[PDB]
Amino acid sequence: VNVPKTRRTFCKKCGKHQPHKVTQYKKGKDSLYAQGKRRYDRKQSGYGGQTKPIFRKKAKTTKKIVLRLECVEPNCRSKRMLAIKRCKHFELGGDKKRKGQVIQF
Amino acid sequence: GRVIRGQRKGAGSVFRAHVKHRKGAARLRAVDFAERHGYIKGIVKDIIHD
Amino acid sequence: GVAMNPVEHPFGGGNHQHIGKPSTIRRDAPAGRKVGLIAARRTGRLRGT
RNA sequence: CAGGUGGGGAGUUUGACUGGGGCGGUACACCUGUCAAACGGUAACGCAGGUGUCCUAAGGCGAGCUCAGGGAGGACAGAAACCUCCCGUGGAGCAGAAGGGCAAAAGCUCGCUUGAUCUUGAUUUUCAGUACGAAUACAGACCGUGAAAGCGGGGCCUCACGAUCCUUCUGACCUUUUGGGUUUUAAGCAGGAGGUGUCAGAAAAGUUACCACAGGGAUAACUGGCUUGUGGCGGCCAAGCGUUCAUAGCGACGUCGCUUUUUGAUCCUUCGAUGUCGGCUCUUCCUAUCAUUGUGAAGCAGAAUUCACCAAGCGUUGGAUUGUU
RNA sequence: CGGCGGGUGUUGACGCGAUGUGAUUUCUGCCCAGUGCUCUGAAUGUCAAAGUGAAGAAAUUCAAUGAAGCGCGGGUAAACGGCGGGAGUAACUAUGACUCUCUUAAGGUAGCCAAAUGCCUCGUCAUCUAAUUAGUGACGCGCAUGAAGGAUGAACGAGAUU
RNA sequence: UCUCGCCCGCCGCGCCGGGGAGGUGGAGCACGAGCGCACGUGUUAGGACCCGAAAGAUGGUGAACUAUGCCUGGGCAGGGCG
RNA sequence: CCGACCCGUCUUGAAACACGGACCAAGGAGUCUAACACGUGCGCGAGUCGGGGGCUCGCACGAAAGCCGCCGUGGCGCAAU
RNA sequence: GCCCGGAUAGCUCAGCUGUAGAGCAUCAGACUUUUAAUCUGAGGGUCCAGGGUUCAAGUCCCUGUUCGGGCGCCA
RNA sequence: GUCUCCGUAGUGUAGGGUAUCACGUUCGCCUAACACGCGAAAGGUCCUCGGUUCGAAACCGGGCGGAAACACCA
Ligand SMILES: [Mg+2]
Ligand SMILES: [Mg+2]
Ligand SMILES: [Mg+2]
Ligand SMILES: [Mg+2]
Ligand SMILES: [Mg+2]
Ligand SMILES: [Mg+2]
Ligand SMILES: [Mg+2]
Ligand SMILES: [Mg+2]
Ligand SMILES: [Mg+2]
Ligand SMILES: [Mg+2]
Ligand SMILES: [Mg+2]
Ligand SMILES: [Mg+2]
Ligand SMILES: [Mg+2]
Ligand SMILES: [Mg+2]
Ligand SMILES: [Mg+2]
Ligand SMILES: [Mg+2]
Ligand SMILES: [Mg+2]
Ligand SMILES: [Mg+2]
Ligand SMILES: [Mg+2]
Ligand SMILES: [Mg+2]
Ligand SMILES: [Mg+2]
Ligand SMILES: [Mg+2]
Ligand SMILES: [Mg+2]
Ligand SMILES: [Mg+2]
Ligand SMILES: [Mg+2]
Ligand SMILES: [Mg+2]
Ligand SMILES: [Mg+2]
Numbered sequence A: 001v002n003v004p005k006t007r008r009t010f011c012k013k014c015g016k017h018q019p020h021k022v023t024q025y026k027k028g029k030d031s032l033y034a035q036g037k038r039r040y041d042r043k044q045s046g047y048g049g050q051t052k053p054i055f056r057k058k059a060k061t062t063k064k065i066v067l068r069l070e071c072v073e074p075n076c077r078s079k080r081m082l083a084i085k086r087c088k089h090f091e092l093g094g095d096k097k098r099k100g101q102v103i104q105f
Numbered sequence B: 001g002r003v004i005r006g007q008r009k010g011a012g013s014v015f016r017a018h019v020k021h022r023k024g025a026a027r028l029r030a031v032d033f034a035e036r037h038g039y040i041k042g043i044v045k046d047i048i049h050d
Numbered sequence C: 001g002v003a004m005n006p007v008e009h010p011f012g013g014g015n016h017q018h019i020g021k022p023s024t025i026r027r028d029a030p031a032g033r034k035v036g037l038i039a040a041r042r043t044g045r046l047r048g049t
Numbered sequence D: 001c002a003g004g005u006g007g008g009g010a011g012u013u014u015g016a017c018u019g020g021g022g023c024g025g026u027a028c029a030c031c032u033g034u035c036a037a038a039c040g041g042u043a044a045c046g047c048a049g050g051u052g053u054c055c056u057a058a059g060g061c062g063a064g065c066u067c068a069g070g071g072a073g074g075a076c077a078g079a080a081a082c083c084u085c086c087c088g089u090g091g092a093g094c095a096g097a098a099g100g101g102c103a104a105a106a107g108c109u110c111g112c113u114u115g116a117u118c119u120u121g122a123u124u125u126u127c128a129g130u131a132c133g134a135a136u137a138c139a140g141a142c143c144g145u146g147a148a149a150g151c152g153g154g155g156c157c158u159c160a161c162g163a164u165c166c167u168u169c170u171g172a173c174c175u176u177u178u179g180g181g182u183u184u185u186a187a188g189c190a191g192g193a194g195g196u197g198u199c200a201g202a203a204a205a206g207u208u209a210c211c212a213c214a215g216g217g218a219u220a221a222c223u224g225g226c227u228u229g230u231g232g233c234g235g236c237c238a239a240g241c242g243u244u245c246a247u248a249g250c251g252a253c254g255u256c257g258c259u260u261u262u263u264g265a266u267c268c269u270u271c272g273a274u275g276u277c278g279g280c281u282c283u284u285c286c287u288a289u290c291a292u293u294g295u296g297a298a299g300c301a302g303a304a305u306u307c308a309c310c311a312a313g314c315g316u317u318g319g320a321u322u323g324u325u
Numbered sequence E: 001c002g003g004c005g006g007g008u009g010u011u012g013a014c015g016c017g018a019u020g021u022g023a024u025u026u027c028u029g030c031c032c033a034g035u036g037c038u039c040u041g042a043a044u045g046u047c048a049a050a051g052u053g054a055a056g057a058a059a060u061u062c063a064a065u066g067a068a069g070c071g072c073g074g075g076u077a078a079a080c081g082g083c084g085g086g087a088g089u090a091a092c093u094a095u096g097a098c099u100c101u102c103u104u105a106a107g108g109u110a111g112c113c114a115a116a117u118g119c120c121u122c123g124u125c126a127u128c129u130a131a132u133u134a135g136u137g138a139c140g141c142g143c144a145u146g147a148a149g150g151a152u153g154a155a156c157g158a159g160a161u162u
Numbered sequence F: 001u002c003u004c005g006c007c008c009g010c011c012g013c014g015c016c017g018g019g020g021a022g023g024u025g026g027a028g029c030a031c032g033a034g035c036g037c038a039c040g041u042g043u044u045a046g047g048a049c050c051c052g053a054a055a056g057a058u059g060g061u062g063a064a065c066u067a068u069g070c071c072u073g074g075g076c077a078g079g080g081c082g
Numbered sequence G: 001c002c003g004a005c006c007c008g009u010c011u012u013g014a015a016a017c018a019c020g021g022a023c024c025a026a027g028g029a030g031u032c033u034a035a036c037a038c039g040u041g042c043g044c045g046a047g048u049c050g051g052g053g054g055c056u057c058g059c060a061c062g063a064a065a066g067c068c069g070c071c072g073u074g075g076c077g078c079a080a081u
Numbered sequence H: 001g002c003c004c005g006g007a008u009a010g011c012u013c014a015g016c017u018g019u020a021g022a023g024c025a026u027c028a029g030a031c032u033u034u035u036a037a038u039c040u041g042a043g044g045g046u047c048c049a050g051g052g053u054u055c056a057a058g059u060c061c062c063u064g065u066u067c068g069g070g071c072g073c074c075a
Numbered sequence I: 001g002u003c004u005c006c007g008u009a010g011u012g013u014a015g016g017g018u019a020u021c022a023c024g025u026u027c028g029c030c031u032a033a034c035a036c037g038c039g040a041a042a043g044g045u046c047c048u049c050g051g052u053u054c055g056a057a058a059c060c061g062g063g064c065g066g067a068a069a070c071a072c073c074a
């Protein structure tokens, strides 16, 4: 799918519709000091082998794309996450389609 | 799941050497002053089958 | 070893007397496994030297 | 202490449905038409199909047009290039399967846009009236569009999807961080995402004829039982064969049966066991009669043979090969 | 389990240890692509802990460096193993010496065969019998023969067969 | 917990404290009904109504049979080939 | 004379050619603890409960019963979110 | 997910923050009885894309897409 | 029977935007002639039907064949 790099949508901090820069959200790096990670490391230390399940039965081929919106107001740089439906090909601000044109021969 | 032959050989029990009728360890004489500085004479008293 | 059962030899077993795995075995194989040609640099017929 | 190697050894697992299991398939989560017996619901490894997507427009609004096809015309131009008129209830299109729906539409083309946004509840669908998903009607903001009424919180409707734990990101000049204070850090509260397709969501390869246990006739292999597709044996019609002549003897196209000496189908009995092929031996029974007794018919001169009737009294053999039937 | 513990070893390559094949005779063909094994580290890529440097107030974060192994490069099949198709073609027909291509890491060589290995199959021909799904001899596009095992060959066998 | 909005308090005038209206979440209030003891029924953990595996683990006993190595003993007519 | 298949059990279906049962005697299988829930009975009742401790000729019964009250600490209830 | 290495005349390799070179492809000449073999030349650029750092870029940084290894694996 | 694959000049094969390679065939050279060699040319509903698409040999279904692999325990 194609979505523009900017959109005018509601900003919760401003409380009104504002322009928003749109990027794609990527999962951040694991903290290694998150409580579950600490519990997992303590559990894994020692003998006993693997103590938690490892999924290894992948079935989905796509992910739900998450749009990171950022209000363009200089005093309001508030961010929001919008998820759109599952898609295989996603692009930001691609070439917009035309109607009455010739297809490449 | 069973200890193999060749593994069982190191335990020794049945795979020890048959040394009952052997005539002794075949060795040169221990080095000493005569070996180190001159020569010592011996006589071949016997030749035997080990 | 091919004439043995799988329980007492790595080469044992099978409906035909075949080794079924490469007879050349690495040097650091555990005891009970390093049977056959141990850490062989070559196999065959020695044609040349 | 750290990394590598490590079936030498250890522990464990090796889905389910299933006209037995395995192989095959997915009838395992969904959607359309039918089944389905005119409310709704309704099954089979029932039938015909589809789905794990796609779309900054194919979303939203407004405006203006009319589509498929056909007829008649126009230089090159022809069956199809473009232009014009006429007919055109949709016979087109609306992303896809199918069904429904739709014409100054919901289709096509333009213009402006982001209601595909921020929120709380209620409700419908499956339903236990639990969840998810999807959907409907509102209400409160902030907007878009249009002159306006209005319409819009995704796609005309019916499908297009995912818990706990954990992780990640976003938001509150928010709460906690353990005797007090400051600051990092961590924890929390609310909302998205990373997925469990066995789709209410374990983390999972084989082999055993060396095998074991608890059971199962809920379930196969052998008999028996229902059935008779297939096998076998008959009948009806008579186009034809029979040098002529349908029917002496046969019988195409059709069609009606019988039998359980074939092989299937099923799984009712038997899994705290009904000894599983063939041969040998021995007895009895059936007739759909090979021979023999008594007959009828012939394309019956005699001889031989063929068809049919009463008929199972009596007989139906010796061997080579093959475990064989 | 452990000790510089113990067996081979009262031993030393004509020795110990580990494999395969299985007397003699005659041979033992091609393939190092795959999986193993092994040799070399050559600039070398990756690569843990520790160590080094930097930022920070510290926890911490980052960077530099870079052991084996793995990659990269050779060898090895008496290591495990493997060893092809489709068309046309000779003055009767029939075969195909021969010729085209596609492809492999190499395309099964010498031999041997309906063999204890061949489905079709009770193969085909000959012999053995009156009659043989049996036996033997021969043939070979051989479902699916084949070389550390192939093919033979006396003597022997409470082995299978005519 | 959201949305809207205006006031009030002071030994600390504050990034202070309190109050309102309208929705919504709660296993609440709205002049108590519990506590103790006994009995019955149901569910559960325990041997768990009774009997029943194939297994798994810990620690011991066996080479008087057999398998193999070592030590020390004993034994094996009569003929053939040559 | 009429009626009458052998019981138990699993089962859609047993008299079954389904299993157990030759006969007799004795033994033989929903128990106790803990925790809940609800119902019922009793006492007191915004309270209730001494169960742990202590005091009482230390003891046939009595290892019982009686009492504590500035022993009500505490539990549950009386307030939720 | 991490460490990287790679994308460039039609094709590949090489390359300087201040004019993208070479080879393999195409074309014109010789060339050889002749084919091969060989130069003479000529034409030919994805400098893998987008944005920024840049006066100025493949060459500096992010957004990316493929390819190859070595790693890493709690919804 | 189930599952999978294939169908393109005469032959053996490559390969969503006017179908490649080699052999073969035709023509002209060279040779006394043939072959080799040299220079040119021709030759294929991409098996059949339907559909998506502006456009199908390719993508998706049906059918004609052909080719493999399974076809076990009693
Ligand atoms: Mg054996
Ligand atoms: Mg083993
Ligand atoms: Mg073996
Ligand atoms: Mg093999
Ligand atoms: Mg194991
Ligand atoms: Mg009805
Ligand atoms: Mg109905
Ligand atoms: Mg309109
Ligand atoms: Mg509204
Ligand atoms: Mg709608
Ligand atoms: Mg489920
Ligand atoms: Mg049954
Ligand atoms: Mg006639
Ligand atoms: Mg019996
Ligand atoms: Mg019997
Ligand atoms: Mg009769
Ligand atoms: Mg030997
Ligand atoms: Mg060889
Ligand atoms: Mg290294
Ligand atoms: Mg070699
Ligand atoms: Mg051969
Ligand atoms: Mg043969
Ligand atoms: Mg045979
Ligand atoms: Mg015979
Ligand atoms: Mg023969
Ligand atoms: Mg021959
Ligand atoms: Mg209850």
Ligand SMILES: [Mg+2]
Pocket (backbone or CB within 6 Å): F047
């Ligand atoms: Mg018990």
Ligand SMILES: [Mg+2]
Pocket (backbone or CB within 6 Å): F056
């Ligand atoms: Mg166990």
Ligand SMILES: [Mg+2]
Pocket (backbone or CB within 6 Å): none
């Ligand atoms: Mg003894």
Ligand SMILES: [Mg+2]
Pocket (backbone or CB within 6 Å): G009, G010, G019
């Ligand atoms: Mg029973």
Ligand SMILES: [Mg+2]
Pocket (backbone or CB within 6 Å): none
């Ligand atoms: Mg039954």
Ligand SMILES: [Mg+2]
Pocket (backbone or CB within 6 Å): G014
């Ligand atoms: Mg009964």
Ligand SMILES: [Mg+2]
Pocket (backbone or CB within 6 Å): G016, G017
């Ligand atoms: Mg019965």
Ligand SMILES: [Mg+2]
Pocket (backbone or CB within 6 Å): none
């Ligand atoms: Mg019985």
Ligand SMILES: [Mg+2]
Pocket (backbone or CB within 6 Å): D272, G019
């Ligand atoms: Mg029973």
Ligand SMILES: [Mg+2]
Pocket (backbone or CB within 6 Å): none
């Ligand atoms: Mg009995």
Ligand SMILES: [Mg+2]
Pocket (backbone or CB within 6 Å): none
């Ligand atoms: Mg009894």
Ligand SMILES: [Mg+2]
Pocket (backbone or CB within 6 Å): none
């Ligand atoms: Mg009694």
Ligand SMILES: [Mg+2]
Pocket (backbone or CB within 6 Å): none
């Ligand atoms: Mg008392």
Ligand SMILES: [Mg+2]
Pocket (backbone or CB within 6 Å): none
């Ligand atoms: Mg108190």
Ligand SMILES: [Zn+2]
Pocket (backbone or CB within 6 Å): A011, A012, A013, A014, A015, A018, A071, A072, A073, A076, A077, A078
């Ligand atoms: Zn804002």
